[PDB]
Amino acid sequence: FERMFKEFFATPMTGTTMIQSSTGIQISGKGFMPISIIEGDQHIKVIAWLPGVNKEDIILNAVGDTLEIRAKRSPLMITESERIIYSEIPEEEEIYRTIKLPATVKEENASAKFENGVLSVILPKAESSIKKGINIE
Amino acid sequence: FERMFKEFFATPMTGTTMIQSSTGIQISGKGFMPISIIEGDQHIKVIAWLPGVNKEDIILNAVGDTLEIRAKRSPLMITESERIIYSEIPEEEEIYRTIKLPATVKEENASAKFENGVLSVILPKAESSIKKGINIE
Amino acid sequence: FERMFKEFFATPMTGTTMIQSSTGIQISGKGFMPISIIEGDQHIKVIAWLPGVNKEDIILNAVGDTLEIRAKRSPLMITESERIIYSEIPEEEEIYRTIKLPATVKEENASAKFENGVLSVILPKAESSIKKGINIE
Amino acid sequence: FERMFKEFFATPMTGTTMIQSSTGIQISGKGFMPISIIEGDQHIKVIAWLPGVNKEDIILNAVGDTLEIRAKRSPLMITESERIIYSEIPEEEEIYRTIKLPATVKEENASAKFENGVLSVILPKAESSIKKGINIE
Amino acid sequence: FERMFKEFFATPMTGTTMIQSSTGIQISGKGFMPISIIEGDQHIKVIAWLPGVNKEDIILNAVGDTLEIRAKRSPLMITESERIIYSEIPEEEEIYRTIKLPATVKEENASAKFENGVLSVILPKAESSIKKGINIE
Amino acid sequence: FERMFKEFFATPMTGTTMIQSSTGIQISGKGFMPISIIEGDQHIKVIAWLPGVNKEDIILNAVGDTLEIRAKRSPLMITESERIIYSEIPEEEEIYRTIKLPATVKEENASAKFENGVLSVILPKAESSIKKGINIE
Amino acid sequence: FERMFKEFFATPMTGTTMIQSSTGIQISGKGFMPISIIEGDQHIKVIAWLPGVNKEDIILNAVGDTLEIRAKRSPLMITESERIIYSEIPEEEEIYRTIKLPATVKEENASAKFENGVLSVILPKAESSIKKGINIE
Amino acid sequence: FERMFKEFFATPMTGTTMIQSSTGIQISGKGFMPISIIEGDQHIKVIAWLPGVNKEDIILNAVGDTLEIRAKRSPLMITESERIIYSEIPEEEEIYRTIKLPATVKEENASAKFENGVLSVILPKAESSIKKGINIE
Amino acid sequence: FERMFKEFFATPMTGTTMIQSSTGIQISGKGFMPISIIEGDQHIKVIAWLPGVNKEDIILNAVGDTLEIRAKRSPLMITESERIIYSEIPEEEEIYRTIKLPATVKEENASAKFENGVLSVILPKAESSIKKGINIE
Amino acid sequence: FERMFKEFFATPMTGTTMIQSSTGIQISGKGFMPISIIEGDQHIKVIAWLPGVNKEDIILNAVGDTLEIRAKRSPLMITESERIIYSEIPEEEEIYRTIKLPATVKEENASAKFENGVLSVILPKAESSIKKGINIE
Amino acid sequence: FERMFKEFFATPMTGTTMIQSSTGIQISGKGFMPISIIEGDQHIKVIAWLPGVNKEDIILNAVGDTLEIRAKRSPLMITESERIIYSEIPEEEEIYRTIKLPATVKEENASAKFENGVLSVILPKAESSIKKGINIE
Amino acid sequence: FERMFKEFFATPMTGTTMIQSSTGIQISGKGFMPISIIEGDQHIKVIAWLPGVNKEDIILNAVGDTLEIRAKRSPLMITESERIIYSEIPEEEEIYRTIKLPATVKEENASAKFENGVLSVILPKAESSIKKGINIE
Amino acid sequence: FERMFKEFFATPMTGTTMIQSSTGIQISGKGFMPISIIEGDQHIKVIAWLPGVNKEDIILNAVGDTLEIRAKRSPLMITESERIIYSEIPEEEEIYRTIKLPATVKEENASAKFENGVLSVILPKAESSIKKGINIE
Amino acid sequence: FERMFKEFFATPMTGTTMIQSSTGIQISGKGFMPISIIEGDQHIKVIAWLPGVNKEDIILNAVGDTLEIRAKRSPLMITESERIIYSEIPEEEEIYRTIKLPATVKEENASAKFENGVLSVILPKAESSIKKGINIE
């Protein structure tokens, strides 16, 4: 049955509904929301693909080492004469992701941008999480 | 090995690289581009998710009953201090889809909109493809 | 043997004796106690089904981000002339659940209600766990 | 796939939706309703767990050797700010059980009690079903 | 695991705990009680092996087409110096069988004998169950 | 085929025909004869279930560390009008068990009782098999 | 047997004898002839590897959207003293490929070059297959 | 997965990348280079298919009983408007084969020809490897 | 091979060498050391079986919510004339367990007793881990 | 299911309940009691791990070539406020081992010591079991 | 396919690219970097094998209970005449390891040495992680 | 069991203990020593990773077409207070590799360098192994 | 894995470490010691292969019907310059066999010879084990 | 069938009849002859176990890099009254081993010793096989 699902290759509908992923960071949520975490020495960059989501429909909250991205995408409106004969776009409306970052961030200084359906969040690291350099002799 | 791939649940990277799907319409391409086809009595609506693609990087061409969507998404630029510790966003740059529509369209009257990373293409059906109504007695 | 257990479908007796579930919240316990966690912006609501448990037999304690629900249900008393020919109700008496919440709560302000065998616990979130809003530009 | 369901251990949602069980008594229904049948010499006791069901929402009808328990549990109301991050409580609203008793009962003298979400029904046996004693020599 | 149980060959402990057997007669019960049903033209003979059961501990009731045999065998008493190093005798105390006969019997005229741990029950058939002879030409 | 035998659950007929069991005591025989061995400091108690066996049909012989129980149960006599439609009682007539005890017994002082189809044999241990106590310091 | 073929790794002899491949273009033929199709906006380039084929032995015909490449490679001539102790080069003489292009081409303006055993065919697209550009607003 | 690879039948890309073949002659290399060895009484003929390789890009060296064929094929150049929609030609650029011949050859007298992408190498056998004739009586 | 290990039943040598167990408490170590954790309202009791360990060879350290038990058992000394023909006692000398308790303890007030090879450790809970009682209305 | 038991790694509870082990010495018993037998030229040393057993609760008897170790360990007493959240210590109370030694011992001269939960029994060999030396020429 | 990988035994290339290992310490990274953690009473020693890494290319940062080792090894430079016919050394350039230590360390007092490609890091434990000794009575 | 080893991913300990690898060059040895062979027209470069090996502990001998690398790495010294809780570094001390080169080398002119735990050996090829160039016409 | 062991064919190291063989004679021991038992009418001949064992290192003891052969073979001494590249000889030093003969022997008259590493033991049968002849009529 | 052979554990008869083993040295022969090869800087030591072989029955020949050991062991002579009831000693008479050494030896200076059934052969290495030392800088 697994090869069949792969043969159907309906990966967006079958996929991108993950409930628990551990990479040393625990991500739990619902719906399609690919996430990329890019950690610098002073901040963390989170890239989230929210295609078809309006900027006003994104609720972005963070605290400590946890980031919550809640968004709702209005489903594709169709006239009565129109009918979806084929569709790969997930129909799920309320999508969300809870991202447990590996470092504490200063949510009071965080900022986020939403361009072309790409949410880029900048989270400055807390002083308690900025690593020092161990001199090698 | 199939359950493992499902357990990894890396569906965007493993998925959304389909080469041949037949729903009575033949779609061949490369990369991540979910497509929804919504056929009316006078036109066909194609919804394509091109997150992170600039409007100038989308080449949209159509003829007869075939639609070609070519787009390139610049990869995520990172400083030398920054590093991708986790990423679900497909890294593939040049994405494309070749959609063989089930009806002939008037490409000279087609139009497309690109909002929030959602490409909506309107393709009026040709007079030779508009179906007549069979009266039932 | 798995299909047989499913064919027997004795899910309450076989089921609802979970020792370790992780949803990003770790729940460990013994016996039948379905739990629903409903997190708001200012509090957490825990719904626990304690059918046949008296209000005086429920010990509800919480601290930090951990909630302990201990309860004992007196087994079904039967006369010597009476005999259980069929039973799906779990016979286990001492049931309990240890719920590790994802946020710190103010146990000094928590409250709980027990109606129709449904335990509803209200746990206000601590100021250190209330998430701030990241403005999107 | 069976071990996986057991590993998921979501027995309430997967379980307690039995359509046909024969113990010499045929029980058919929908939803979660554990039943215990305790037969005496003069009556039959039916224990049904209806957690979260109001007494006014239980329709209890019986005739001959068949007992029908119909009940509806209002789903968990949540504010727009609140969201179910985790839930083991079955969401099914209209639950019911049709119990074919092994003996004829006098439905005109039956009684039932509903305490702590436990429905206890007393069904006196008909004179045609009260067994006589065979003296052993 | 099945061959292992057969290799262990602990058939009394593993076996003789049947809950549902249909031979056109439905037998449901608990414990070890081999049953033989020997139907004549005017009566039904039931042979039940109740080894180690006292005559006073056997409750024999019947009605219509159902026979209930309830008996309890006191477990093997042992001194503190004595210890069961090996045992094949089932330890279950309360044994019972519910036998649904294929014909209606006159329980008011039934009789039973208990010799050498063998219960022999005589159940005269009701006039409504005595079959007539179809002459063949 | 093993699950089928278990589904048939004809354990008395399939079972209780063991030819070689080792528990440190070797038991070999034919037919249905559950045995329990209960060893004290001064004697050994053997409990054998011989349902439907007459006291005159039991030949009980012992020597050294071996016990032989031979018995024959007359089969269920039936009239020509009567017919076994269902039977779980083993039809085998000549049953026997050869029990190799773990200790030497004084067969000249052994005694046995036969009540309710239960054979209880008392075998005093020989002086060469009575264990001494090792004082612990 | 599949791993064995892979272990033998005789891929040219076992491989490159495909009868039906669909990439949205249907290729049917016999023998070893790797094909690469490189579609531009105004023409289609077909690269075919015809090692050891003389230019005079290649018959190249096209019409509409179908291209037929027929060629014969003279087998390796050997003296009577010489003998093939090892060979991976396919011995098949008459090789051919029928390529159904996805667009109509102007066979009257097509050209082909044969250098180093590489056949490069240029097929200008017909005006009915040149796609127009859909302006995006 | 093996049948799938055979069903994909992408034998050139999957195949022709052999690292170790023993026919009594050991061939190790990288890339696609079918080899045929044709041994005479006085010389050895090696046929290597180097389609699309220029004569100046072939480095042919030999010594003792080992032959090394190194060649690089420039990849298929494509305009920005052109795109490979389908390709069976291996993309690997640097191909090579190390052939351990079964006989010592006089590399100072060897010669090679490169026509139609077929490399034909003539390697005269050393006097120490020319076999004598054993007269049969 | 798993049934064989179970048939060998060498569970002490094969078993009791666990490296990672999660019960909501993480235990990592080496060697045979069964652990029982018994949590009260004011303290935690840890029972560790250290058979053959001298009181002076047990190093018991704790901090925060982690308990480390290090002990070494001198191996069984044997004369040259003596030889281990059979042994189930694990030969491993340096055994240890790292127990991450679920609550913070006051290591400055902890105490432990070692009797009959049973280590009983009393760890008073910290004020920050003592749970309060939520009144139910 | 075997790998699962190994993954659970509950070897003390699953293990150490062996009923029949033959190493040329037959050991039968119940419960957890690792045994090491160390045979010298003049005696046999038996090491038994009886953790948590009081010296007064050990009954040590021997005769001929058989050793019986009977002991009972009082279960872990817990206050009503205390609860076993985790436990690897076997709960079985009455443990015993019957060891059939390979040589006859003089039980009248045997001695045993019980230190740190380790029972060490010294059993002098009988003159009939002391082996003589065969001179080699 | 697993035995094949083991038969290939290319463990460095296949291996040493671990993303998530839990020993009660969580290690996540990329590339080949064997790690040994040696915990004392006052410090933690981390041994990392960084063969072919220059001391200036190692970035060693630590904070709290997490250690990050970032290093880049310049790939093996080869002349155009030189070619890697065989290689087991991983080609990956940017290697890194993120080590979550089990105890908090004083990164301000840490030191590291790099000799013979072995990185030895000394991390003094914080006062909050130094365990006290529980006296045993 | 193979997937388990891969899941354990202990590739250094399980791996890098190869006894026989043939790439047309036969390598036999013991321990962890990744080898890269880089063959030029006039010499052979061998790169061996000997992390933690002192230059004085490497014995490098060669003759003809065989290279022997013998080295011993002193194991990680630890204080009695220190203990290896986690380790991926192979503990094997005496490592060695026997490399049969494909060409004869002039061991009298060979040289080797040992930097950062990387052994680089330069082996000039013998005149009898330097390949000549076959002119292509 | 079994075929692999057979393919490795390391039968001496894997083999000849038998712990329990029954041919009606029970042999238990450790190490490599092939045994041949050749029973005559008046004696028993035991042939044991003790290659590399000195006559002074063989301890041969017998009594009743049991024979114990204990021997130690000094391991192969090697200079520091010498190294075992290949070895099939078992490295185990202390080898032994316990042979339970089928007849009682007179150990006071037994003799043994040790030539070419072959131990030949002559054990005269006891008068109680010499069989008489049953005349056939 | 493989586990059965292992259960039979007749490794000498089944084993030690190897026809082709490659350790970089090729050993082919017949019969039981364990071989250990111990290579020094100036010689090679071959240890062969020839139990029960007379010194006059060993033919030891060597040349170049090949060693041939031929020996015949007279089978165990038995009187007509004597009979092999049990035997593990291989019955094969003519045993032999052909050992291809990795280095050329000076057979004119070789020597061999035969003590306790152990053949020790000393083979001085030829000057062409003595490896030189590559100085490391």
Side-chain angles (χ1 to χ4, degrees), chain H residues 20 26 55 60-63 66 68 112-113, chain L residues 23-24 128 130-137:
Chain H
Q20 295 295 100
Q26 171 266 292
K55 199 209 299 290
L60 177 63
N61 311 310
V63 80
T66 180
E68 188 199 22
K113 288 182 177 181
Chain L
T23 300
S128 62
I130 293 167
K131 308 188 176 180
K132 308 327 163 194
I134 305 175
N135 292 305
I136 308 177
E137 61 277 359

PDB file of all heavy atoms in Angstrom, chain H residues 20 26 55 60-63 66 68 112-113, chain L residues 23-24 128 130-137:
ATOM      1  N   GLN H  20      33.863  -3.276 -11.219  1.00  0.00           N
ATOM      2  CA  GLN H  20      34.697  -4.498 -11.142  1.00  0.00           C
ATOM      3  C   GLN H  20      34.006  -5.645 -11.880  1.00  0.00           C
ATOM      4  O   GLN H  20      32.966  -6.121 -11.373  1.00  0.00           O
ATOM      5  CB  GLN H  20      35.011  -4.882  -9.697  1.00  0.00           C
ATOM      6  CG  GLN H  20      35.872  -3.845  -8.987  1.00  0.00           C
ATOM      7  CD  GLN H  20      37.252  -3.723  -9.588  1.00  0.00           C
ATOM      8  OE1 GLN H  20      37.524  -2.805 -10.366  1.00  0.00           O
ATOM      9  NE2 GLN H  20      38.134  -4.647  -9.231  1.00  0.00           N
ATOM     10  N   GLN H  26      40.342  -8.298 -15.684  1.00  0.00           N
ATOM     11  CA  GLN H  26      39.716  -7.427 -14.699  1.00  0.00           C
ATOM     12  C   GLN H  26      39.581  -6.022 -15.266  1.00  0.00           C
ATOM     13  O   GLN H  26      40.584  -5.387 -15.617  1.00  0.00           O
ATOM     14  CB  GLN H  26      40.541  -7.406 -13.414  1.00  0.00           C
ATOM     15  CG  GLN H  26      40.100  -6.373 -12.398  1.00  0.00           C
ATOM     16  CD  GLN H  26      40.862  -5.071 -12.507  1.00  0.00           C
ATOM     17  OE1 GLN H  26      42.057  -5.008 -12.216  1.00  0.00           O
ATOM     18  NE2 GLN H  26      40.185  -4.032 -12.981  1.00  0.00           N
ATOM     19  N   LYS H  55      38.645  12.935 -30.995  1.00  0.00           N
ATOM     20  CA  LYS H  55      39.889  12.174 -31.038  1.00  0.00           C
ATOM     21  C   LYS H  55      40.959  12.784 -30.140  1.00  0.00           C
ATOM     22  O   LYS H  55      41.788  12.058 -29.580  1.00  0.00           O
ATOM     23  CB  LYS H  55      40.391  12.079 -32.480  1.00  0.00           C
ATOM     24  CG  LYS H  55      41.400  10.967 -32.722  1.00  0.00           C
ATOM     25  CD  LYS H  55      42.365  11.305 -33.852  1.00  0.00           C
ATOM     26  CE  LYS H  55      41.640  11.512 -35.177  1.00  0.00           C
ATOM     27  NZ  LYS H  55      41.093  10.240 -35.724  1.00  0.00           N
ATOM     28  N   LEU H  60      45.042   7.264 -24.619  1.00  0.00           N
ATOM     29  CA  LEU H  60      45.171   5.816 -24.717  1.00  0.00           C
ATOM     30  C   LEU H  60      46.582   5.412 -24.304  1.00  0.00           C
ATOM     31  O   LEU H  60      47.549   5.705 -25.016  1.00  0.00           O
ATOM     32  CB  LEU H  60      44.854   5.364 -26.141  1.00  0.00           C
ATOM     33  CG  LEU H  60      44.992   3.880 -26.467  1.00  0.00           C
ATOM     34  CD1 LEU H  60      44.005   3.091 -25.637  1.00  0.00           C
ATOM     35  CD2 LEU H  60      44.765   3.622 -27.948  1.00  0.00           C
ATOM     36  N   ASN H  61      46.698   4.739 -23.159  1.00  0.00           N
ATOM     37  CA  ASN H  61      47.979   4.276 -22.645  1.00  0.00           C
ATOM     38  C   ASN H  61      47.890   2.789 -22.330  1.00  0.00           C
ATOM     39  O   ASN H  61      46.842   2.303 -21.893  1.00  0.00           O
ATOM     40  CB  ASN H  61      48.398   5.047 -21.389  1.00  0.00           C
ATOM     41  CG  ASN H  61      48.290   6.546 -21.564  1.00  0.00           C
ATOM     42  OD1 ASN H  61      48.792   7.108 -22.537  1.00  0.00           O
ATOM     43  ND2 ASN H  61      47.647   7.208 -20.609  1.00  0.00           N
ATOM     44  N   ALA H  62      48.990   2.073 -22.555  1.00  0.00           N
ATOM     45  CA  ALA H  62      49.045   0.650 -22.259  1.00  0.00           C
ATOM     46  C   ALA H  62      50.447   0.259 -21.816  1.00  0.00           C
ATOM     47  O   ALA H  62      51.436   0.915 -22.155  1.00  0.00           O
ATOM     48  CB  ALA H  62      48.635  -0.189 -23.474  1.00  0.00           C
ATOM     49  N   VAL H  63      50.515  -0.829 -21.051  1.00  0.00           N
ATOM     50  CA  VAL H  63      51.785  -1.395 -20.610  1.00  0.00           C
ATOM     51  C   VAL H  63      51.514  -2.813 -20.142  1.00  0.00           C
ATOM     52  O   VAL H  63      50.457  -3.104 -19.578  1.00  0.00           O
ATOM     53  CB  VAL H  63      52.431  -0.533 -19.494  1.00  0.00           C
ATOM     54  CG1 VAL H  63      51.802  -0.827 -18.136  1.00  0.00           C
ATOM     55  CG2 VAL H  63      53.934  -0.761 -19.449  1.00  0.00           C
ATOM     56  N   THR H  66      47.958  -4.418 -19.186  1.00  0.00           N
ATOM     57  CA  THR H  66      46.928  -3.481 -18.751  1.00  0.00           C
ATOM     58  C   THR H  66      46.771  -2.358 -19.767  1.00  0.00           C
ATOM     59  O   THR H  66      47.765  -1.809 -20.258  1.00  0.00           O
ATOM     60  CB  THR H  66      47.252  -2.905 -17.368  1.00  0.00           C
ATOM     61  OG1 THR H  66      46.217  -1.998 -16.970  1.00  0.00           O
ATOM     62  CG2 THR H  66      48.593  -2.179 -17.366  1.00  0.00           C
ATOM     63  N   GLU H  68      44.646   1.315 -20.409  1.00  0.00           N
ATOM     64  CA  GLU H  68      43.876   2.400 -19.806  1.00  0.00           C
ATOM     65  C   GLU H  68      43.336   3.308 -20.901  1.00  0.00           C
ATOM     66  O   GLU H  68      44.112   3.869 -21.684  1.00  0.00           O
ATOM     67  CB  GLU H  68      44.740   3.197 -18.827  1.00  0.00           C
ATOM     68  CG  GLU H  68      43.972   4.221 -18.004  1.00  0.00           C
ATOM     69  CD  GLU H  68      44.872   5.285 -17.400  1.00  0.00           C
ATOM     70  OE1 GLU H  68      45.988   5.493 -17.919  1.00  0.00           O
ATOM     71  OE2 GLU H  68      44.460   5.913 -16.402  1.00  0.00           O
ATOM     72  N   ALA H 112      45.825   2.405 -32.853  1.00  0.00           N
ATOM     73  CA  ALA H 112      44.399   2.549 -32.603  1.00  0.00           C
ATOM     74  C   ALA H 112      43.764   3.477 -33.628  1.00  0.00           C
ATOM     75  O   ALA H 112      44.394   4.417 -34.117  1.00  0.00           O
ATOM     76  CB  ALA H 112      44.136   3.083 -31.190  1.00  0.00           C
ATOM     77  N   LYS H 113      42.501   3.192 -33.942  1.00  0.00           N
ATOM     78  CA  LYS H 113      41.714   3.961 -34.893  1.00  0.00           C
ATOM     79  C   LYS H 113      40.425   4.402 -34.214  1.00  0.00           C
ATOM     80  O   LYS H 113      39.865   3.677 -33.388  1.00  0.00           O
ATOM     81  CB  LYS H 113      41.388   3.147 -36.150  1.00  0.00           C
ATOM     82  CG  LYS H 113      42.577   2.918 -37.063  1.00  0.00           C
ATOM     83  CD  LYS H 113      42.179   2.150 -38.311  1.00  0.00           C
ATOM     84  CE  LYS H 113      43.356   1.981 -39.255  1.00  0.00           C
ATOM     85  NZ  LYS H 113      42.979   1.248 -40.491  1.00  0.00           N
TER      86      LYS H 113
ATOM     87  N   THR L  23      39.218  -3.696  -5.490  1.00  0.00           N
ATOM     88  CA  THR L  23      38.917  -2.672  -6.487  1.00  0.00           C
ATOM     89  C   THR L  23      39.874  -2.860  -7.664  1.00  0.00           C
ATOM     90  O   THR L  23      40.136  -1.932  -8.433  1.00  0.00           O
ATOM     91  CB  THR L  23      39.024  -1.277  -5.861  1.00  0.00           C
ATOM     92  OG1 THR L  23      38.084  -1.188  -4.784  1.00  0.00           O
ATOM     93  CG2 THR L  23      38.645  -0.158  -6.844  1.00  0.00           C
ATOM     94  N   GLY L  24      40.405  -4.071  -7.797  1.00  0.00           N
ATOM     95  CA  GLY L  24      41.530  -4.383  -8.647  1.00  0.00           C
ATOM     96  C   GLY L  24      42.821  -4.211  -7.882  1.00  0.00           C
ATOM     97  O   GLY L  24      43.901  -4.494  -8.416  1.00  0.00           O
ATOM     98  N   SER L 128      58.985  -0.151 -15.325  1.00  0.00           N
ATOM     99  CA  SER L 128      58.216  -1.242 -15.911  1.00  0.00           C
ATOM    100  C   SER L 128      56.712  -1.028 -15.816  1.00  0.00           C
ATOM    101  O   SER L 128      55.960  -1.765 -16.463  1.00  0.00           O
ATOM    102  CB  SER L 128      58.587  -2.562 -15.235  1.00  0.00           C
ATOM    103  OG  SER L 128      58.266  -2.536 -13.856  1.00  0.00           O
ATOM    104  N   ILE L 130      55.331   2.379 -15.982  1.00  0.00           N
ATOM    105  CA  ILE L 130      54.959   3.637 -16.619  1.00  0.00           C
ATOM    106  C   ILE L 130      54.428   3.324 -18.014  1.00  0.00           C
ATOM    107  O   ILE L 130      55.136   2.757 -18.851  1.00  0.00           O
ATOM    108  CB  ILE L 130      56.154   4.601 -16.677  1.00  0.00           C
ATOM    109  CG1 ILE L 130      56.537   5.044 -15.265  1.00  0.00           C
ATOM    110  CG2 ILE L 130      55.829   5.824 -17.530  1.00  0.00           C
ATOM    111  CD1 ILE L 130      57.884   5.729 -15.181  1.00  0.00           C
ATOM    112  N   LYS L 131      53.175   3.698 -18.256  1.00  0.00           N
ATOM    113  CA  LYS L 131      52.502   3.389 -19.509  1.00  0.00           C
ATOM    114  C   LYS L 131      52.921   4.336 -20.624  1.00  0.00           C
ATOM    115  O   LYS L 131      53.137   5.529 -20.401  1.00  0.00           O
ATOM    116  CB  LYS L 131      50.987   3.451 -19.311  1.00  0.00           C
ATOM    117  CG  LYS L 131      50.502   2.608 -18.144  1.00  0.00           C
ATOM    118  CD  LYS L 131      48.989   2.529 -18.069  1.00  0.00           C
ATOM    119  CE  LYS L 131      48.551   1.596 -16.954  1.00  0.00           C
ATOM    120  NZ  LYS L 131      47.073   1.489 -16.844  1.00  0.00           N
ATOM    121  N   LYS L 132      53.033   3.790 -21.831  1.00  0.00           N
ATOM    122  CA  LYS L 132      53.374   4.568 -23.010  1.00  0.00           C
ATOM    123  C   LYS L 132      52.086   5.036 -23.683  1.00  0.00           C
ATOM    124  O   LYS L 132      50.994   4.554 -23.380  1.00  0.00           O
ATOM    125  CB  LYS L 132      54.214   3.741 -23.985  1.00  0.00           C
ATOM    126  CG  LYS L 132      55.464   3.063 -23.405  1.00  0.00           C
ATOM    127  CD  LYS L 132      56.156   3.841 -22.283  1.00  0.00           C
ATOM    128  CE  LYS L 132      57.094   2.944 -21.493  1.00  0.00           C
ATOM    129  NZ  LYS L 132      57.509   3.567 -20.207  1.00  0.00           N
ATOM    130  N   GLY L 133      52.215   5.983 -24.606  1.00  0.00           N
ATOM    131  CA  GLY L 133      51.063   6.532 -25.299  1.00  0.00           C
ATOM    132  C   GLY L 133      50.919   5.934 -26.688  1.00  0.00           C
ATOM    133  O   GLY L 133      51.865   5.928 -27.478  1.00  0.00           O
ATOM    134  N   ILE L 134      49.719   5.435 -26.967  1.00  0.00           N
ATOM    135  CA  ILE L 134      49.391   4.842 -28.259  1.00  0.00           C
ATOM    136  C   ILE L 134      48.806   5.943 -29.139  1.00  0.00           C
ATOM    137  O   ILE L 134      47.693   6.413 -28.898  1.00  0.00           O
ATOM    138  CB  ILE L 134      48.421   3.664 -28.108  1.00  0.00           C
ATOM    139  CG1 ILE L 134      49.000   2.626 -27.140  1.00  0.00           C
ATOM    140  CG2 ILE L 134      48.145   3.020 -29.462  1.00  0.00           C
ATOM    141  CD1 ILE L 134      48.064   1.475 -26.824  1.00  0.00           C
ATOM    142  N   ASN L 135      49.554   6.351 -30.160  1.00  0.00           N
ATOM    143  CA  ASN L 135      49.065   7.379 -31.068  1.00  0.00           C
ATOM    144  C   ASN L 135      47.824   6.891 -31.805  1.00  0.00           C
ATOM    145  O   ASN L 135      47.756   5.745 -32.255  1.00  0.00           O
ATOM    146  CB  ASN L 135      50.154   7.761 -32.071  1.00  0.00           C
ATOM    147  CG  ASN L 135      51.324   8.472 -31.419  1.00  0.00           C
ATOM    148  OD1 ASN L 135      51.151   9.488 -30.747  1.00  0.00           O
ATOM    149  ND2 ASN L 135      52.524   7.937 -31.616  1.00  0.00           N
ATOM    150  N   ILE L 136      46.834   7.775 -31.923  1.00  0.00           N
ATOM    151  CA  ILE L 136      45.573   7.478 -32.595  1.00  0.00           C
ATOM    152  C   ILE L 136      45.578   8.178 -33.946  1.00  0.00           C
ATOM    153  O   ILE L 136      45.874   9.376 -34.032  1.00  0.00           O
ATOM    154  CB  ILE L 136      44.364   7.922 -31.752  1.00  0.00           C
ATOM    155  CG1 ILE L 136      44.464   7.362 -30.331  1.00  0.00           C
ATOM    156  CG2 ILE L 136      43.063   7.465 -32.402  1.00  0.00           C
ATOM    157  CD1 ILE L 136      43.339   7.805 -29.414  1.00  0.00           C
ATOM    158  N   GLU L 137      45.247   7.431 -34.996  1.00  0.00           N
ATOM    159  CA  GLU L 137      45.233   7.965 -36.352  1.00  0.00           C
ATOM    160  C   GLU L 137      43.815   7.967 -36.919  1.00  0.00           C
ATOM    161  O   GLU L 137      42.941   7.246 -36.438  1.00  0.00           O
ATOM    162  CB  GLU L 137      46.165   7.156 -37.259  1.00  0.00           C
ATOM    163  CG  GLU L 137      45.803   5.679 -37.395  1.00  0.00           C
ATOM    164  CD  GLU L 137      46.343   4.832 -36.257  1.00  0.00           C
ATOM    165  OE1 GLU L 137      47.027   5.384 -35.370  1.00  0.00           O
ATOM    166  OE2 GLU L 137      46.080   3.611 -36.249  1.00  0.00           O
TER     167      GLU L 137
END
